[PDB]
């Protein structure tokens with residue numbers, strides 16, 4: 327990322343309620359790309375959109391996932407090292423196709439657009455697209 | 471690439487007639503993915519698969535492209551630096567969507583499989599997949 | 615397939631877009647060029663700077679085509695046939711780019727539809743834009 | 756859309772596969788696990804070693820489904836209905852992986868059909884595997 331890009335990322339993330347945005351992004355992933363529900367068989371009712379979005383276990387996991395994402399924004403020059411441990415986790419224990427990381431990235435971008443409206447300008451989006459691509463790349467990196 | 475993967479690539483490539491494989495790979499690109507013909511309006515008759523495959527201008531460009539690919543196999547540890555200015559050329563002057571590089575890489579793998587048959591084993595394929603992905607990434611890297 | 619609920623959601627959302635459709639199409643293109651720069655390779659003759667009238671005019675065409683698709687959501691292949699010919703045989707845009715524009719159309723809608731862009735409507739709009747993309751690439755080979 | 760020539764080409768080429776259809780399915784799966792290791796995430800409790808009964812058995816299942824498809828090439832949605840249900844509702848394999856298996860099936864055919872794998876047949880086989888993939892992901896949402 328460039329300096330203008332990092333500045334745009336940091337400026338918008340200062341306004342982000344990570345717990346709330348994370349539950350919203352994970353819930354929307356499950357609604358929009360419902361095959362992603364395969365990883366959440368124990369999470370209870372996922373039968374309708376309102377049930378997915380209101381599901382406390384979805385919300386709690388979304389908070390965990392975006393919390394780690396948030397932590398990574400402090401290390402934008404070393405995403406591979408920052409997420410290596412989670413990459414191996416997601417391969418070795420969780421068996422998660424890294425394509426899921428790319429889907430979640432584009433849902434998060436839609437959530438940011440929806441929440442922030444005009445403030446999520448085209449240059450801000452372009453910076454966040456680089457971030458979510460980089461995080462997905464980093465989380466995929468230890469797969470083999 | 472591992473040392474054995476490098477060895478597998480070089481040993482197979484030492485058996486390749488680069489002019490012939492290049493002409494066929496570019497011809498098959500234009501046949502299998504005919505929207506790639508958009509760059510070659512000046513090349514004459516592309517009306518049938520036989521016309522494409524027999525087209526001397528298609529063959530000539532295939533020789534040039536695969537020759538550069540071939541010479542690049544001496545720099546597998548520095549593909550990005552090797553192809554940086556060619557990346558810039560394809561972006562800036564030629565307006566070539568880098569997806570074309572990925573399609574050509576997949577056609578090249580099919581040509582190698584057809585030409586070498588059983589010698590093009592699953593592990594030899596995996597090595598060449600890393601190669602064509604790396605060349606495509608190197609040629610896409612300067613796009614902005 | 616687009617379900618009855620999907621078509622209802624799409625008509626509802628695109629109806630709220632209403633007369634802003636053209637502006638939103640331009641914005642989606644701008645978002646695409648900045649977020650996915652390889653897509654600029656299809657417009658080497660354009661000024662692609664912010665506010666470009668060429669991007670505005672193309673945005674209007676894209677949006678009007680989507681308005682026409684929504685109006686023909688039950689018989690979209692025929693409505694879009696001329697555009698399928700154009701993209702398959704003249705423009706020859708690689709099919710991977712349609713997902714990029716679709717994502718940016720979805721982001722643009724999200725940025726303008728605080729109430730309407732519910733999770734369900736999001737899902738329907740994503741399916742709808744994928745279906746338009748499928749129709750537009752259906753004659754490529 | 757599969758042209759009449761596509762159907763002729765696919766029937767002739769898969770006809771030559773004949774009794775090896777099973778073996779070639781197994782080899783295609785091994786090519787994909789090695790070239791595209793992320794696909795292994797769908798086989799976590801599965802013996803993926805070279806030559807395993809499980810990869811052989813699954814390769815046969817895949818190949819027989821393709822034989823079914825070729826035989827019913829004019830009506831693949833109906834011929835593959837149970838399999839499209841299964842992938843959409845239970846297996847839930849991300850759609851991007853069908854392009855990977857398709858490429859590896861195509862490479863397997865190229866390596867085993869020296870006589871048949873002309874440029875035109877290559878195109879037809881690529882379209883056919885893409886059409887099968889489309890049918891198998893048609894019910895995902």
Ligand code: HEM
Nearest residue numbers: 362365366390391392394395412420422426427430461465
């Ligand atoms: C930015 C992207 C992502 C990040 C940073 C992330 C991070 C995390 C973290 C921190 C955990 C908790 C690990 C622990 O137990 O200590 C976790 C668990 C998990 N994640 Fe990811 N994740 C991401 C994307 C995804 C996606 C897209 C999926 C599937 C669609 C997924 C599936 C899972 C599953 C199944 C678990 C275990 C859930 C359970 O406890 O039952 N993750 N992830």
Ligand code: HEM
Nearest residue numbers: 506509534535536538539556560564566570571574605609
């Ligand atoms: C392995 C991938 C490729 C390599 C290594 C490669 C290499 C080259 C080279 C060395 C040139 C000559 C540049 C010069 O001296 O001016 C060239 C030109 C060109 N390439 Fe690429 N190329 C690749 C893929 C592609 C693909 C897939 C396409 C389009 C489908 C493409 C389109 C073109 C065009 C249109 C030209 C201009 C040719 C002319 O003016 O006669 N290239 N490329």
Ligand code: HEM
Nearest residue numbers: 653656657672675676679680697705707711712715746747
């Ligand atoms: C929702 C998807 C799309 C729709 C509805 C759409 C629609 C259109 C329309 C209505 C036109 C004007 C045709 C005319 O003048 O008669 C057009 C032209 C064009 N489109 Fe597409 N398009 C889509 C996707 C794409 C994508 C993804 C690209 C490239 C990234 C692209 C590149 C172009 C180009 C280069 C032109 C020619 C523009 C000019 O020279 O004025 N389109 N499209």
Ligand code: HEM
Nearest residue numbers: 794797798813816817820821838846848852853856887888
């Ligand atoms: C040409 C595309 C495909 C065809 C024709 C196909 C066909 C089949 C068939 C016939 C079965 C057995 C169903 C049964 O026993 O009831 C199956 C199962 C399965 N497929 Fe698909 N498949 C395709 C693509 C994929 C891809 C791309 C993946 C993942 C990368 C995948 C993952 C699986 C898995 C995990 C199973 C279950 C295996 C088992 O339980 O032993 N399939 N498929």
Ligand SMILES: O=C(N[C@H](CO)[C@H](O)c1ccc(NO)cc1)C(Cl)Cl
Nearest residue numbers: 752753755756757758759760761882
């Ligand atoms: O071949 C195809 N399209 C041809 C133009 O490329 C032409 O329209 C056509 C030819 C034969 C048939 N039916 O025998 C239908 C349409 C489709 Cl079917 Cl891929």
